[PDB]
Symmetry: C5
Subunit: 110 residues, 5 copies
Amino acid sequence: LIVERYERVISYLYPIAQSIPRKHGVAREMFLKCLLGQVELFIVAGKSNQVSKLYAADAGLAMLRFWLRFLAGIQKPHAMTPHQVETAQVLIAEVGRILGSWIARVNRKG
Amino acid sequence: MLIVERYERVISYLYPIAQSIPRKHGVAREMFLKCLLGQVELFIVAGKSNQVSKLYAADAGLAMLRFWLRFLAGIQHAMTPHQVETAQVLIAEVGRILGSWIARVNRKGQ
Amino acid sequence: MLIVERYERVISYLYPIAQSIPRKHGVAREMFLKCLLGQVELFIVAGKSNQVSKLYAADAGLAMLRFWLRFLAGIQKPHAMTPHQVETAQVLIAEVGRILGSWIARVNR
Amino acid sequence: MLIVERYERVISYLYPIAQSIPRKHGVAREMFLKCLLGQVELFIVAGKSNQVSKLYAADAGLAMLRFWLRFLAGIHAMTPHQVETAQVLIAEVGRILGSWIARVNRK
Amino acid sequence: MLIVERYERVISYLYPIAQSIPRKHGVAREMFLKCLLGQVELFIVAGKSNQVSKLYAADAGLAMLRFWLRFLAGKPHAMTPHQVETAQVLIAEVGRILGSWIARVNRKG
Protein backbone atom coordinates (compact mmCIF):
# COMPACT_ATOMS: atom_id res chain seq x y z
CA LEU A 1 0.00 0.00 0.00
CA ILE A 2 2.53 2.52 1.15
CA VAL A 3 4.76 1.07 -1.60
CA GLU A 4 1.89 1.41 -4.12
CA ARG A 5 1.33 5.04 -3.16
CA TYR A 6 5.08 5.58 -3.20
CA GLU A 7 5.40 4.20 -6.75
CA ARG A 8 3.32 7.24 -7.80
CA VAL A 9 6.10 9.43 -6.45
CA ILE A 10 8.69 7.39 -8.32
CA SER A 11 6.55 7.62 -11.45
CA TYR A 12 6.48 11.42 -11.13
CA LEU A 13 10.06 12.15 -10.03
CA TYR A 14 12.01 9.48 -11.96
CA PRO A 15 11.72 11.14 -15.43
CA ILE A 16 12.77 14.39 -13.78
CA ALA A 17 15.87 12.74 -12.28
CA GLN A 18 16.61 11.26 -15.73
CA SER A 19 16.50 14.78 -17.22
CA ILE A 20 19.17 16.18 -14.85
CA PRO A 21 22.40 17.10 -16.75
CA ARG A 22 25.63 15.02 -16.38
CA LYS A 23 27.17 18.24 -15.13
CA HIS A 24 25.28 17.35 -11.93
CA GLY A 25 26.02 13.60 -12.12
CA VAL A 26 26.82 13.20 -8.41
CA ALA A 27 23.85 15.10 -7.02
CA ARG A 28 21.68 13.34 -9.54
CA GLU A 29 22.93 9.86 -8.57
CA MET A 30 22.38 10.70 -4.88
CA PHE A 31 18.87 11.89 -5.71
CA LEU A 32 18.04 8.70 -7.64
CA LYS A 33 19.43 6.50 -4.86
CA CYS A 34 17.28 8.44 -2.37
CA LEU A 35 14.21 8.13 -4.56
CA LEU A 36 14.38 4.41 -5.44
CA GLY A 37 16.04 3.41 -2.19
CA GLN A 38 13.02 4.68 -0.27
CA VAL A 39 11.09 1.55 -1.33
CA GLU A 40 13.66 -0.57 0.44
CA LEU A 41 13.19 1.43 3.64
CA PHE A 42 9.42 0.68 3.45
CA ILE A 43 9.82 -3.00 2.58
CA VAL A 44 12.38 -3.47 5.37
CA ALA A 45 10.16 -1.79 7.96
CA GLY A 46 7.38 -4.03 6.69
CA LYS A 47 9.38 -7.26 7.07
CA SER A 48 10.47 -6.45 10.65
CA ASN A 49 9.04 -5.44 14.02
CA GLN A 50 11.12 -2.41 14.95
CA VAL A 51 9.68 1.13 14.97
CA SER A 52 13.20 2.43 14.36
CA LYS A 53 12.87 1.19 10.79
CA LEU A 54 9.72 3.30 10.18
CA TYR A 55 11.44 6.26 11.78
CA ALA A 56 14.17 5.67 9.19
CA ALA A 57 11.63 5.53 6.35
CA ASP A 58 10.39 8.91 7.71
CA ALA A 59 13.86 10.47 7.50
CA GLY A 60 13.93 9.09 3.97
CA LEU A 61 10.86 11.13 3.04
CA ALA A 62 12.23 14.31 4.64
CA MET A 63 15.43 13.80 2.67
CA LEU A 64 13.54 13.34 -0.59
CA ARG A 65 11.89 16.70 0.08
CA PHE A 66 15.27 18.28 0.56
CA TRP A 67 16.14 17.00 -2.90
CA LEU A 68 13.15 18.86 -4.38
CA ARG A 69 14.37 22.09 -2.77
CA PHE A 70 17.86 21.39 -4.22
CA LEU A 71 16.69 20.72 -7.77
CA ALA A 72 14.32 23.67 -7.60
CA GLY A 73 16.50 26.24 -5.96
CA ILE A 74 20.16 25.36 -5.64
CA GLN A 75 21.03 23.52 -8.81
CA LYS A 76 21.89 25.85 -11.73
CA PRO A 77 20.11 25.43 -14.13
CA HIS A 78 17.13 24.40 -12.01
CA ALA A 79 15.63 20.98 -12.79
CA MET A 80 12.13 21.51 -11.32
CA THR A 81 9.50 24.30 -11.24
CA PRO A 82 7.56 25.57 -8.16
CA HIS A 83 4.54 23.61 -9.39
CA GLN A 84 6.53 20.42 -10.11
CA VAL A 85 7.86 20.67 -6.55
CA GLU A 86 4.31 21.26 -5.28
CA THR A 87 2.98 18.26 -7.29
CA ALA A 88 5.72 16.07 -5.86
CA GLN A 89 5.17 17.43 -2.33
CA VAL A 90 1.58 16.34 -2.60
CA LEU A 91 2.41 12.78 -3.70
CA ILE A 92 4.96 12.54 -0.89
CA ALA A 93 2.72 13.94 1.88
CA GLU A 94 0.16 11.25 1.13
CA VAL A 95 2.76 8.58 1.66
CA GLY A 96 3.88 10.44 4.78
CA ARG A 97 0.37 10.47 6.21
CA ILE A 98 0.05 6.71 5.79
CA LEU A 99 3.45 6.31 7.43
CA GLY A 100 2.41 8.54 10.30
CA SER A 101 -0.57 6.30 11.00
CA TRP A 102 1.48 3.14 10.64
CA ILE A 103 3.89 4.54 13.25
CA ALA A 104 0.99 5.51 15.49
CA ARG A 105 -0.66 2.09 15.16
CA VAL A 106 2.62 0.41 16.11
CA ASN A 107 3.43 2.74 19.03
CA ARG A 108 -0.14 2.08 20.29
CA LYS A 109 0.67 -1.65 20.46
CA GLY A 110 3.44 -0.68 22.92
CA MET B 1 20.91 -23.95 1.44
CA LEU B 2 19.38 -25.21 -1.77
CA ILE B 3 17.93 -21.71 -1.42
CA VAL B 4 21.20 -20.18 -2.50
CA GLU B 5 21.14 -22.55 -5.48
CA ARG B 6 17.55 -21.64 -6.41
CA TYR B 7 18.73 -18.06 -6.04
CA GLU B 8 21.72 -18.57 -8.32
CA ARG B 9 19.05 -19.54 -10.88
CA VAL B 10 17.36 -16.13 -10.40
CA ILE B 11 20.80 -14.62 -10.93
CA SER B 12 21.50 -16.61 -14.10
CA TYR B 13 18.28 -15.42 -15.69
CA LEU B 14 18.29 -11.80 -14.45
CA TYR B 15 21.96 -10.84 -14.76
CA PRO B 16 22.38 -10.78 -18.53
CA ILE B 17 19.04 -8.94 -18.79
CA ALA B 18 20.20 -6.32 -16.26
CA GLN B 19 23.53 -6.11 -18.10
CA SER B 20 21.63 -5.23 -21.25
CA ILE B 21 19.75 -2.31 -19.67
CA PRO B 22 20.73 0.86 -21.59
CA ARG B 23 23.09 3.40 -19.93
CA LYS B 24 20.23 5.86 -20.31
CA HIS B 25 19.05 4.21 -17.08
CA GLY B 26 22.61 3.65 -15.84
CA VAL B 27 21.95 4.32 -12.15
CA ALA B 28 18.80 2.23 -11.93
CA ARG B 29 20.68 -0.56 -13.71
CA GLU B 30 23.57 -0.45 -11.24
CA MET B 31 21.37 -0.26 -8.14
CA PHE B 32 19.52 -3.26 -9.51
CA LEU B 33 22.66 -5.28 -10.22
CA LYS B 34 23.84 -4.44 -6.69
CA CYS B 35 20.51 -5.62 -5.27
CA LEU B 36 20.42 -8.71 -7.48
CA LEU B 37 23.91 -9.97 -6.46
CA GLY B 38 24.21 -8.60 -2.93
CA GLN B 39 21.15 -10.70 -2.14
CA VAL B 40 23.26 -13.83 -1.91
CA GLU B 41 24.99 -12.22 1.05
CA LEU B 42 21.64 -11.81 2.84
CA PHE B 43 21.17 -15.56 2.38
CA ILE B 44 24.67 -16.48 3.51
CA VAL B 45 24.38 -14.32 6.67
CA ALA B 46 20.94 -15.75 7.40
CA GLY B 47 22.00 -19.39 7.22
CA LYS B 48 25.11 -18.83 9.30
CA SER B 49 22.94 -17.27 12.02
CA ASN B 50 20.13 -18.33 14.36
CA GLN B 51 18.07 -15.11 14.35
CA VAL B 52 14.78 -14.92 12.42
CA SER B 53 15.44 -11.21 11.92
CA LYS B 54 18.13 -12.14 9.32
CA LEU B 55 15.59 -14.33 7.54
CA TYR B 56 13.27 -11.36 7.40
CA ALA B 57 16.13 -9.19 6.11
CA ALA B 58 16.54 -11.81 3.38
CA ASP B 59 12.84 -11.63 2.63
CA ALA B 60 13.03 -7.83 2.33
CA GLY B 61 15.78 -8.34 -0.23
CA LEU B 62 13.49 -10.54 -2.30
CA ALA B 63 10.56 -8.11 -2.05
CA MET B 64 12.99 -5.40 -3.19
CA LEU B 65 14.03 -7.48 -6.18
CA ARG B 66 10.38 -7.81 -7.23
CA PHE B 67 9.94 -4.04 -6.97
CA TRP B 68 12.89 -3.77 -9.35
CA LEU B 69 10.92 -5.95 -11.80
CA ARG B 70 7.81 -3.80 -11.68
CA PHE B 71 9.95 -0.68 -11.94
CA LEU B 72 12.08 -1.90 -14.84
CA ALA B 73 9.08 -3.26 -16.76
CA GLY B 74 7.15 0.00 -16.66
CA ILE B 75 10.05 1.97 -18.09
CA GLN B 76 10.48 3.76 -21.43
CA HIS B 77 11.52 -0.54 -22.38
CA ALA B 78 13.90 -2.50 -20.11
CA MET B 79 12.23 -5.88 -19.61
CA THR B 80 9.81 -7.76 -21.84
CA PRO B 81 6.69 -8.89 -19.90
CA HIS B 82 7.82 -12.43 -20.68
CA GLN B 83 11.07 -11.66 -18.89
CA VAL B 84 9.21 -10.26 -15.88
CA GLU B 85 6.87 -13.27 -15.66
CA THR B 86 9.72 -15.72 -16.01
CA ALA B 87 11.86 -14.06 -13.31
CA GLN B 88 8.83 -13.98 -11.03
CA VAL B 89 8.62 -17.79 -11.19
CA LEU B 90 12.26 -18.23 -10.21
CA ILE B 91 11.92 -15.68 -7.37
CA ALA B 92 8.67 -17.30 -6.14
CA GLU B 93 10.47 -20.62 -6.02
CA VAL B 94 13.15 -19.12 -3.74
CA GLY B 95 10.47 -17.46 -1.66
CA ARG B 96 8.43 -20.53 -0.75
CA ILE B 97 11.59 -22.14 0.60
CA LEU B 98 12.27 -18.93 2.53
CA GLY B 99 8.68 -18.90 3.75
CA SER B 100 9.05 -22.38 5.20
CA TRP B 101 12.48 -21.79 6.68
CA ILE B 102 10.93 -18.67 8.27
CA ALA B 103 7.75 -20.33 9.54
CA ARG B 104 10.02 -23.18 10.76
CA VAL B 105 12.16 -20.99 13.07
CA ASN B 106 8.86 -19.51 14.35
CA ARG B 107 7.34 -22.95 15.06
CA LYS B 108 10.67 -23.65 16.83
CA GLY B 109 10.51 -20.39 18.81
CA GLN B 110 7.62 -21.76 20.89
CA MET C 1 14.35 22.91 9.68
CA LEU C 2 15.78 26.30 10.65
CA ILE C 3 19.23 24.73 10.99
CA VAL C 4 18.63 23.12 7.62
CA GLU C 5 17.57 26.42 6.04
CA ARG C 6 20.83 27.91 7.34
CA TYR C 7 22.73 24.90 6.09
CA GLU C 8 21.25 25.26 2.63
CA ARG C 9 23.18 28.54 2.52
CA VAL C 10 26.40 26.59 3.06
CA ILE C 11 25.29 24.25 0.24
CA SER C 12 24.47 26.95 -2.27
CA TYR C 13 27.84 28.61 -1.66
CA LEU C 14 29.84 25.41 -1.71
CA TYR C 15 28.00 23.26 -4.27
CA PRO C 16 28.95 25.20 -7.42
CA ILE C 17 32.58 25.38 -6.14
CA ALA C 18 32.66 21.66 -5.31
CA GLN C 19 31.16 20.87 -8.67
CA SER C 20 33.86 22.99 -10.36
CA ILE C 21 36.66 20.99 -8.73
CA PRO C 22 38.79 19.56 -11.59
CA ARG C 23 38.03 15.92 -12.45
CA LYS C 24 41.67 14.96 -11.67
CA HIS C 25 40.55 15.05 -8.04
CA GLY C 26 37.44 13.08 -9.01
CA VAL C 27 37.40 10.81 -5.98
CA ALA C 28 37.94 13.60 -3.43
CA ARG C 29 35.52 15.82 -5.33
CA GLU C 30 32.87 13.13 -4.95
CA MET C 31 33.52 12.53 -1.28
CA PHE C 32 33.32 16.27 -0.69
CA LEU C 33 30.03 16.45 -2.56
CA LYS C 34 28.66 13.49 -0.60
CA CYS C 35 29.65 14.99 2.73
CA LEU C 36 28.23 18.44 1.85
CA LEU C 37 24.82 17.11 0.81
CA GLY C 38 24.62 14.03 3.01
CA GLN C 39 24.91 16.39 5.92
CA VAL C 40 21.29 17.41 5.52
CA GLU C 41 20.35 13.83 6.36
CA LEU C 42 22.48 14.06 9.53
CA PHE C 43 20.28 16.97 10.61
CA ILE C 44 17.05 15.33 9.49
CA VAL C 45 17.86 12.10 11.35
CA ALA C 46 18.63 14.16 14.47
CA GLY C 47 15.44 16.11 13.80
CA LYS C 48 13.11 13.08 13.41
CA SER C 49 14.57 11.88 16.70
CA ASN C 50 15.28 12.55 20.35
CA GLN C 51 18.76 11.15 20.99
CA VAL C 52 21.61 13.64 21.51
CA SER C 53 23.98 11.03 20.06
CA LYS C 54 22.41 11.87 16.68
CA LEU C 55 22.96 15.61 17.19
CA TYR C 56 26.61 14.76 17.94
CA ALA C 57 26.95 12.88 14.65
CA ALA C 58 25.61 15.94 12.87
CA ASP C 59 28.37 17.88 14.66
CA ALA C 60 31.03 15.43 13.48
CA GLY C 61 29.64 15.88 9.97
CA LEU C 62 30.35 19.61 10.09
CA ALA C 63 33.77 18.86 11.54
CA MET C 64 34.42 16.59 8.56
CA LEU C 65 33.15 19.26 6.18
CA ARG C 66 35.65 21.72 7.66
CA PHE C 67 38.38 19.17 7.00
CA TRP C 68 37.38 19.02 3.33
CA LEU C 69 37.74 22.79 3.06
CA ARG C 70 41.26 22.76 4.55
CA PHE C 71 42.18 19.84 2.36
CA LEU C 72 40.83 21.34 -0.86
CA ALA C 73 42.40 24.78 -0.35
CA GLY C 74 45.73 23.05 0.21
CA ILE C 75 45.96 20.52 -2.63
CA GLN C 76 47.88 20.77 -5.85
CA LYS C 77 48.33 19.66 -9.44
CA PRO C 78 45.71 21.14 -9.90
CA HIS C 79 44.36 23.45 -7.20
CA ALA C 80 40.78 23.02 -5.98
CA MET C 81 39.69 25.93 -3.77
CA THR C 82 41.08 29.29 -2.68
CA PRO C 83 41.82 30.23 0.92
CA HIS C 84 39.23 32.98 0.43
CA GLN C 85 36.48 30.55 -0.54
CA VAL C 86 37.38 28.49 2.55
CA GLU C 87 37.16 31.59 4.69
CA THR C 88 33.75 32.54 3.28
CA ALA C 89 32.35 29.07 3.82
CA GLN C 90 33.49 28.95 7.47
CA VAL C 91 31.39 32.03 8.13
CA LEU C 92 28.35 30.13 6.83
CA ILE C 93 29.26 26.90 8.67
CA ALA C 94 29.88 28.70 11.96
CA GLU C 95 26.34 30.08 11.92
CA VAL C 96 25.01 26.55 11.41
CA GLY C 97 27.27 25.38 14.27
CA ARG C 98 25.87 28.05 16.58
CA ILE C 99 22.30 27.00 15.89
CA LEU C 100 23.42 23.41 16.45
CA GLY C 101 24.85 24.67 19.73
CA SER C 102 21.52 26.17 20.84
CA TRP C 103 19.74 23.01 19.74
CA ILE C 104 22.12 20.64 21.60
CA ALA C 105 21.57 22.90 24.61
CA ARG C 106 17.77 22.85 24.49
CA VAL C 107 17.89 19.04 24.18
CA ASN C 108 20.49 18.08 26.84
CA ARG C 109 17.85 19.63 29.10
CA MET D 1 47.27 -11.58 12.10
CA LEU D 2 48.35 -14.93 10.68
CA ILE D 3 45.03 -14.79 8.80
CA VAL D 4 45.69 -11.52 6.94
CA GLU D 5 49.04 -12.74 5.69
CA ARG D 6 47.49 -15.98 4.42
CA TYR D 7 44.63 -14.01 2.93
CA GLU D 8 47.16 -11.88 1.09
CA ARG D 9 48.01 -14.95 -0.95
CA VAL D 10 44.37 -15.05 -2.01
CA ILE D 11 44.55 -11.37 -3.06
CA SER D 12 47.84 -11.93 -4.92
CA TYR D 13 46.35 -14.69 -7.02
CA LEU D 14 42.84 -13.29 -7.41
CA TYR D 15 43.49 -9.53 -7.96
CA PRO D 16 45.15 -9.78 -11.42
CA ILE D 17 42.34 -12.06 -12.57
CA ALA D 18 39.74 -9.63 -11.28
CA GLN D 19 41.53 -6.83 -13.17
CA SER D 20 41.37 -8.49 -16.60
CA ILE D 21 37.55 -8.95 -16.48
CA PRO D 22 36.12 -6.99 -19.48
CA ARG D 23 34.43 -3.64 -18.69
CA LYS D 24 31.31 -5.30 -20.08
CA HIS D 25 30.94 -6.84 -16.63
CA GLY D 26 31.71 -3.47 -15.03
CA VAL D 27 29.51 -3.56 -11.94
CA ALA D 28 30.15 -7.23 -11.05
CA ARG D 29 33.86 -6.72 -11.66
CA GLU D 30 33.89 -3.89 -9.15
CA MET D 31 31.74 -5.52 -6.46
CA PHE D 32 34.01 -8.53 -6.66
CA LEU D 33 37.21 -6.46 -6.30
CA LYS D 34 35.55 -4.72 -3.39
CA CYS D 35 34.72 -8.02 -1.74
CA LEU D 36 38.19 -9.40 -2.37
CA LEU D 37 40.03 -6.34 -1.04
CA GLY D 38 37.43 -5.44 1.60
CA GLN D 39 37.88 -8.82 3.27
CA VAL D 40 41.18 -7.73 4.82
CA GLU D 41 39.29 -5.08 6.74
CA LEU D 42 36.80 -7.60 8.10
CA PHE D 43 39.81 -9.52 9.48
CA ILE D 44 41.50 -6.43 10.89
CA VAL D 45 38.30 -5.33 12.64
CA ALA D 46 37.67 -8.70 14.29
CA GLY D 47 41.28 -8.59 15.48
CA LYS D 48 40.99 -5.10 17.01
CA SER D 49 37.85 -6.29 18.82
CA ASN D 50 36.38 -8.82 21.20
CA GLN D 51 32.92 -9.44 19.71
CA VAL D 52 32.59 -12.82 17.95
CA SER D 53 30.08 -11.18 15.60
CA LYS D 54 33.04 -9.52 13.85
CA LEU D 55 34.44 -12.99 13.17
CA TYR D 56 31.21 -14.43 11.74
CA ALA D 57 31.12 -11.24 9.69
CA ALA D 58 34.55 -12.19 8.41
CA ASP D 59 33.19 -15.68 7.71
CA ALA D 60 30.27 -14.23 5.77
CA GLY D 61 32.78 -12.28 3.71
CA LEU D 62 34.59 -15.52 2.84
CA ALA D 63 31.33 -17.23 1.92
CA MET D 64 30.60 -14.33 -0.40
CA LEU D 65 34.08 -14.48 -1.86
CA ARG D 66 33.31 -18.12 -2.68
CA PHE D 67 30.12 -17.06 -4.46
CA TRP D 68 32.05 -14.66 -6.69
CA LEU D 69 34.15 -17.53 -7.99
CA ARG D 70 31.07 -19.62 -8.84
CA PHE D 71 29.75 -16.50 -10.51
CA LEU D 72 32.83 -15.71 -12.62
CA ALA D 73 32.89 -19.32 -13.79
CA GLY D 74 29.31 -19.32 -15.06
CA ILE D 75 29.58 -16.07 -17.04
CA HIS D 76 35.08 -17.29 -20.44
CA ALA D 77 36.32 -14.93 -17.67
CA MET D 78 37.67 -17.61 -15.26
CA THR D 79 39.26 -21.02 -16.08
CA PRO D 80 38.29 -23.94 -13.76
CA HIS D 81 41.98 -24.34 -12.94
CA GLN D 82 41.89 -20.83 -11.46
CA VAL D 83 38.79 -21.63 -9.40
CA GLU D 84 40.58 -24.79 -8.23
CA THR D 85 43.67 -22.87 -7.09
CA ALA D 86 41.70 -20.02 -5.53
CA GLN D 87 39.38 -22.29 -3.55
CA VAL D 88 42.48 -23.87 -1.92
CA LEU D 89 43.95 -20.53 -0.81
CA ILE D 90 40.54 -19.57 0.62
CA ALA D 91 40.21 -22.90 2.38
CA GLU D 92 43.60 -22.17 3.97
CA VAL D 93 42.32 -18.84 5.28
CA GLY D 94 38.96 -20.40 6.23
CA ARG D 95 40.89 -23.01 8.20
CA ILE D 96 42.58 -20.39 10.39
CA LEU D 97 39.32 -18.50 10.83
CA GLY D 98 37.74 -21.78 11.91
CA SER D 99 40.23 -22.25 14.75
CA TRP D 100 40.19 -18.57 15.82
CA ILE D 101 36.41 -18.66 16.23
CA ALA D 102 36.32 -21.93 18.21
CA ARG D 103 39.05 -20.61 20.52
CA VAL D 104 36.95 -17.52 21.19
CA ASN D 105 33.84 -19.63 21.79
CA ARG D 106 35.52 -21.87 24.37
CA LYS D 107 34.45 -19.31 27.01
CA MET E 1 43.38 16.81 17.80
CA LEU E 2 47.08 17.00 17.14
CA ILE E 3 46.16 13.54 15.88
CA VAL E 4 44.26 14.94 12.88
CA GLU E 5 47.17 17.37 12.25
CA ARG E 6 49.55 14.41 12.48
CA TYR E 7 47.33 12.48 10.10
CA GLU E 8 47.17 15.37 7.61
CA ARG E 9 50.91 14.82 7.03
CA VAL E 10 50.13 11.23 6.05
CA ILE E 11 47.54 12.58 3.65
CA SER E 12 50.03 15.15 2.29
CA TYR E 13 52.59 12.49 1.58
CA LEU E 14 50.19 9.87 0.26
CA TYR E 15 47.54 11.73 -1.77
CA PRO E 16 49.81 12.70 -4.67
CA ILE E 17 51.07 9.13 -4.73
CA ALA E 18 47.56 7.67 -4.75
CA GLN E 19 46.76 10.07 -7.58
CA SER E 20 49.61 8.87 -9.81
CA ILE E 21 48.37 5.27 -9.67
CA PRO E 22 47.34 4.34 -13.23
CA ARG E 23 43.65 3.86 -14.14
CA LYS E 24 44.63 0.24 -14.82
CA HIS E 25 44.11 -0.16 -11.06
CA GLY E 26 41.15 2.24 -10.96
CA VAL E 27 39.01 0.35 -8.46
CA ALA E 28 41.91 -0.17 -6.05
CA ARG E 29 43.02 3.43 -6.40
CA GLU E 30 39.61 4.61 -5.20
CA MET E 31 39.31 2.22 -2.27
CA PHE E 32 42.75 3.46 -1.24
CA LEU E 33 41.65 7.08 -1.53
CA LYS E 34 38.48 6.30 0.40
CA CYS E 35 40.36 4.65 3.20
CA LEU E 36 43.00 7.44 3.21
CA LEU E 37 40.80 10.51 3.29
CA GLY E 38 38.00 8.62 5.05
CA GLN E 39 40.21 8.05 8.08
CA VAL E 40 39.80 11.67 9.16
CA GLU E 41 36.13 11.03 9.88
CA LEU E 42 37.11 8.03 12.03
CA PHE E 43 39.25 10.30 14.23
CA ILE E 44 36.70 13.14 14.11
CA VAL E 45 33.91 10.75 15.13
CA ALA E 46 36.04 9.25 17.88
CA GLY E 47 36.50 12.68 19.48
CA LYS E 48 32.80 13.66 19.55
CA SER E 49 31.96 10.31 21.18
CA ASN E 50 33.07 8.69 24.46
CA GLN E 51 32.75 5.07 23.23
CA VAL E 52 36.05 3.17 22.96
CA SER E 53 34.52 1.18 20.10
CA LYS E 54 34.94 4.30 17.92
CA LEU E 55 38.64 4.48 18.87
CA TYR E 56 39.07 0.87 17.82
CA ALA E 57 37.42 1.54 14.48
CA ALA E 58 39.97 4.33 13.96
CA ASP E 59 42.81 1.97 14.88
CA ALA E 60 41.29 -0.57 12.52
CA GLY E 61 41.33 2.16 9.91
CA LEU E 62 45.05 2.88 10.42
CA ALA E 63 45.62 -0.84 10.19
CA MET E 64 43.74 -1.01 6.90
CA LEU E 65 45.81 1.95 5.64
CA ARG E 66 49.04 0.09 6.36
CA PHE E 67 47.62 -2.87 4.40
CA TRP E 68 47.12 -0.63 1.32
CA LEU E 69 50.77 0.25 1.30
CA ARG E 70 51.79 -3.41 1.17
CA PHE E 71 49.27 -4.05 -1.57
CA LEU E 72 50.36 -1.11 -3.73
CA ALA E 73 54.06 -1.89 -3.05
CA GLY E 74 53.61 -5.24 -4.81
CA LYS E 75 49.92 -3.63 -8.15
CA PRO E 76 53.34 -5.10 -9.14
CA HIS E 77 55.07 -1.76 -9.85
CA ALA E 78 53.19 1.20 -8.24
CA MET E 79 54.79 2.22 -4.88
CA THR E 80 58.55 2.30 -4.23
CA PRO E 81 59.75 0.71 -0.95
CA HIS E 82 61.21 4.13 -0.10
CA GLN E 83 57.79 5.73 -0.43
CA VAL E 84 56.37 2.95 1.72
CA GLU E 85 59.16 3.40 4.27
CA THR E 86 58.34 7.10 4.42
CA ALA E 87 54.58 6.61 4.86
CA GLN E 88 55.19 3.99 7.58
CA VAL E 89 57.02 6.56 9.71
CA LEU E 90 54.31 9.20 9.35
CA ILE E 91 51.51 6.73 10.16
CA ALA E 92 53.57 5.42 13.09
CA GLU E 93 53.51 8.97 14.41
CA VAL E 94 49.71 8.74 14.32
CA GLY E 95 49.91 5.22 15.74
CA ARG E 96 51.67 6.55 18.85
CA ILE E 97 49.13 9.31 19.47
CA LEU E 98 46.20 6.92 19.13
CA GLY E 99 47.80 4.10 21.10
CA SER E 100 48.25 6.53 23.96
CA TRP E 101 44.70 7.83 23.46
CA ILE E 102 43.20 4.30 23.40
CA ALA E 103 45.25 3.09 26.39
CA ARG E 104 44.23 6.06 28.57
CA VAL E 105 40.50 5.40 28.21
CA ASN E 106 41.28 1.85 29.35
CA ARG E 107 42.80 3.38 32.48
CA LYS E 108 39.73 5.64 32.58
CA GLY E 109 37.15 2.87 32.87
